[PDB]
Amino acid sequence: DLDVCAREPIHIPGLIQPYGVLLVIDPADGRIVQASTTAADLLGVPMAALLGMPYTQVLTLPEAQPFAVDDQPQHLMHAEVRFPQRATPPASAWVAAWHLYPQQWLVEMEPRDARLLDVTLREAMPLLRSVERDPGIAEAAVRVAKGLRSLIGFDRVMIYRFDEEWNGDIIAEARKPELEAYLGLHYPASDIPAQARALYLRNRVRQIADVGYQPSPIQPTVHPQLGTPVDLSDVSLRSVSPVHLEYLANMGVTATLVASIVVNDALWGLISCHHYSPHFTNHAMRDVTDAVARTLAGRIGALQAVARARLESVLLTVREKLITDFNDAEHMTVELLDDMAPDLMDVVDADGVAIFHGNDISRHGTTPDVAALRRIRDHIESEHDAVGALHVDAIGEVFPELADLAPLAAGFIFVPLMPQSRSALLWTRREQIQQIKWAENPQLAKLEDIPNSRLSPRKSFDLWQQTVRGRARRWSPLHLESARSLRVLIELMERKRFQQDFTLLEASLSRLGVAIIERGTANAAHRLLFVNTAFADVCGSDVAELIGRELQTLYASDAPRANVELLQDALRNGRAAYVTLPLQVYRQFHLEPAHWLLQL
Numbered sequence: 001d002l003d004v005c006a007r008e009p010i011h012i013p014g015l016i017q018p019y020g021v022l023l024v025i026d027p028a029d030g031r032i033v034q035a036s037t038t039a040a041d042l043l044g045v046p047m048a049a050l051l052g053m054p055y056t057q058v059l060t061l062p063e064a065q066p067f068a069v070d071d072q073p074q075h076l077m078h079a080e081v082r083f084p085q086r087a088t089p090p091a092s093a094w095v096a097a098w099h100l101y102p103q104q105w106l107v108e109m110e111p112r113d114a115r116l117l118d119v120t121l122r123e124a125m126p127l128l129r130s131v132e133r134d135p136g137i138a139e140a141a142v143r144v145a146k147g148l149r150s151l152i153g154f155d156r157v158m159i160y161r162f163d164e165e166w167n168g169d170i171i172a173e174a175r176k177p178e179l180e181a182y183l184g185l186h187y188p189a190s191d192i193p194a195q196a197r198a199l200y201l202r203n204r205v206r207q208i209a210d211v212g213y214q215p216s217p218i219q220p221t222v223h224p225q226l227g228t229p230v231d232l233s234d235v236s237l238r239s240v241s242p243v244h245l246e247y248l249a250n251m252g253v254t255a256t257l258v259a260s261i262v263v264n265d266a267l268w269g270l271i272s273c274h275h276y277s278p279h280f281t282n283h284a285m286r287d288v289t290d291a292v293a294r295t296l297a298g299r300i301g302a303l304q305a306v307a308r309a310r311l312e313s314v315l316l317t318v319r320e321k322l323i324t325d326f327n328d329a330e331h332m333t334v335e336l337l338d339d340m341a342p343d344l345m346d347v348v349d350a351d352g353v354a355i356f357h358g359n360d361i362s363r364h365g366t367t368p369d370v371a372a373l374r375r376i377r378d379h380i381e382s383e384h385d386a387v388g389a390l391h392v393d394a395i396g397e398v399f400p401e402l403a404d405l406a407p408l409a410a411g412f413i414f415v416p417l418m419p420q421s422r423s424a425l426l427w428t429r430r431e432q433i434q435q436i437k438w439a440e441n442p443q444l445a446k447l448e449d450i451p452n453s454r455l456s457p458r459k460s461f462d463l464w465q466q467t468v469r470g471r472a473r474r475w476s477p478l479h480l481e482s483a484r485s486l487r488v489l490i491e492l493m494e495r496k497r498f499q500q501d502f503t504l505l506e507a508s509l510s511r512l513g514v515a516i517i518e519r520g521t522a523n524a525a526h527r528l529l530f531v532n533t534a535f536a537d538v539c540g541s542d543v544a545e546l547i548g549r550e551l552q553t554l555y556a557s558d559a560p561r562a563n564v565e566l567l568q569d570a571l572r573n574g575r576a577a578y579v580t581l582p583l584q585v586y587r588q589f590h591l592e593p594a595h596w597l598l599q600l
């Protein structure tokens, strides 16, 4: 309640959802040791008589049987269950699922079907086949929400995406026109506790048939000879926290079906179905919903793989241009930087870029004012894994003097392009509040609170807005690396500008393994000043991906060693080392001396 519920043990509630029946069985004699209150009317045997009876006397299993487990628990899927002690058979056919653990057996039973018609895999396959051919995550998510709304009959279907902090974003939505649109709403991580999140990942599909259900207590409560509560981590009939029930009741929601979106074994988000009237989702439709979630997750991870590859090639194109369009000599490395500005932003997913050249500042995306850009660099200057670049995700938390610049520079990446020079580069990101899709849902601004409520979508949207205030989406170590490797390449080219300029590079490029190595002037390290195509072919990396790299980064192969110190003493003094060692494959390293001429 209020705060303590963040660490509520929602897996041992001692209650179940009354639409089904649960039994706890002793795996050696088959005696029922514990049972839900709903077991007495279903099996037709009084609760007192039932507790201490073998399951074979009260229920019949024509299909799969329970078997003793030793190591990993086994879970038998839902199959036909009959009741021999009933005076009359039940109105609906019942189905049973087994959760077999080494010392305990759990049998959860529910009706085979709803008062609705069953949707099969065959009816779902066009949706599945379509989701697989969708061009974007947004298209795929919208298609699912609409699809799952038609297949299963839900009033609302929403797609959530979790951020790194586990905050939720309603990226897609499908609903009855009359319903309030929550698309574009974000909620804080605290709204779904870590155990709730863990169970959704574990369960795959989780339902709430009737929010206003009368909880069915597990009786006797604690195991008669072990004294432990029933762990319902795998039981789908598991009761829901009275906090969540209060949330849904305020909303008018009477049923929910939540399915996991698991991308690369991790929880990416969820599919949440909300009904405004009771809705039992049978085992067959739950299996279909599961198959729909797997397909959407499959597509996301595919579109996320294509996206990485796209970015990697864009990054390599800006590196290729930085080396080739610098060799013009009479063209500033800050001038072509201004032309590349949209690609510069893409490489680190920046909302804007500011190119510094003394007092001259050139803004490109969504960046603060020139006076605010001056303030940022000037405050950084006065302050004077391993990346040679300053970055922040919340400007006011690190530099409270610049706190008022959080709307357009909540997060930034600062790289001085020569610390000797007043030339630099500032990538910016706006605060998370700025990114709210008001356009995609004009009703969001107009979204009002539930009066008399302790919990609501309005309260949750406010809480999130409060938590992410003055903070940008965090910079990935990937995006962080790209910026340091750009600063390395820019400064290397800016050092190449005044350190022995020659036509020898053009003569070395023409001929066939060949690379020029800069000494580095007793600091940072010895880098690849220039490289040839054959050198990149033997290495495996690209000509622009290899220029700027370290000499130690070449033989990133740990296995050789032996020498290393013999190569380092020729680097630390400026002499020659004709020692052969492998790279990424065994090749000969022929170093010859300000700059070294290496070939392999």
Ligand SMILES: */C=C\C1=C(C)C(=O)N/C1=C\C1=NC(=C\c2[nH]c(/C=C3/NC(=O)C(C=C)=C3C)c(C)c2CCC(=O)O)/C(CCC(=O)O)=C1C
Pocket (backbone or CB within 6 Å): 001, 002, 003, 004, 005, 006, 010, 182, 185, 186, 187, 190, 191, 192, 193, 196, 206, 239, 240, 241, 243, 244, 247, 256, 258, 272, 455, 456, 457, 460, 461
């Ligand atoms: C003490 C912790 C909790 C607070 C605070 C609270 O508000 N709920 C808490 C506990 C649980 N939440 C669970 C699931 C859940 N909650 C939400 C919250 C929302 N924020 C929004 O803006 C909206 C809608 C616009 C909602 C619905 C959400 C999205 C979820 C995921 C499930 C769903 O979408 O229906 C749970 C798990 C309950 C269970 O047993 O299934 C707990 C315990």
